[PDB]
Design a protein around this ligand. Structure first.
Ligand code: NAG
Length: 154
């Protein structure tokens, strides 16, 4: 009808299998392929270009996309997500007006405990992986305090 029906006429000059539609040359494209302006020739979709394709390094492929992970990260079953190889929980330390508030949600516990409470006004927080220590700074005290993750050796 509308189109020249070239799909039926001659594969309709469609890169992918032509799909003769009553209007004419419709053609098609497999997953991960997009029709061009002629809507007959298929292109390659760069899934890596799309944000959130995978948690880590991405490799565009024909109609699909390969992804990698960090040495400390494990690729999930879906192949589009990386998860930490180490089983240790994440200690989401958050400073407070006079204390340090840390959350351990391992095994959906939501362990919210105040690691340090004898503080004037703590602003910055950081940790050392090698020594397993926690560094934080107090504005009013004007000092940089250090302690272990067990809240000791302050
Ligand atoms: C805290 O952890 C460190 C590293 O394991 C250890 O050396 C230190 O003795 C611990 N302190 C307490 C009292 O938990």
């Amino acid at each position: 009808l509308c189109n020249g029906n070239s799909c039926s006429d001659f594969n309709g000059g469609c890169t992918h299998e032509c799909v003769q539609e009553p209007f004419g040359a419709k053609c098609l494209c497999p997953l991960g392929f997009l029709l061009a302006n002629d809507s007959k020739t298929c292109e390659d979709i760069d899934e890596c270009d799309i944000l959130g394709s995978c948690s880590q390094h991405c490799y565009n492929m024909r109609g699909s996309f390969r992804c990698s992970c960090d040495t400390g990260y494990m690729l999930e079953s879906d192949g589009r997500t990386c998860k930490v190889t180490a089983s240790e929980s994440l200690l989401l330390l958050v400073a407070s007006q006079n204390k340090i508030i840390a959350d351990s949600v391992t095994s959906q516990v939501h362990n919210i405990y105040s690691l340090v409470e004898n503080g004037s006004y703590i602003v910055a927080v950081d940790f050392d992986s090698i020594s397993g220590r926690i560094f934080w700074s107090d504005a009013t005290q004007g000092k940089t305090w250090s302690a272990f993750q067990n809240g000791t050796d302050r």
